Amino acid sequence: MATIKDVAKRANVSTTTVSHVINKTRFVAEETRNAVWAAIKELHYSPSAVARSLKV
Structure with missing residues (x-):
């Protein structure tokens, strides 16, 4: 589990x-x-939508 x-x-x-x-x-x-x-993407901890993030 991760977030920020x-x-x-x-x-x-x-x-x-x-x-x-x-x-x-x-x-x-x-x-x-x-x-x-770099670290944000390296560790990866999307607060919402683990897949990615696009549109609305």
């Missing part, structure tokens, strides 16, 4: 660091950005 905590703890310390990349409030030097997007 998994990658948040694996890649960074908490979701706080993850949100920084999304809201671009503290744009890191690409390192964290790439690491986050």
Whole structure:
């Protein structure tokens, strides 16, 4: 089972660091950005629709 905590703890310390990349409030030097997007797909923890996500 996974959702958000998994990658948040694996890649960074908490979701706080993850949100920084999304809201671009503290744009890191690409390192964290790439690491986050990479880890998200690597570990995979779709909160909804395990298959994928498209349309509505």
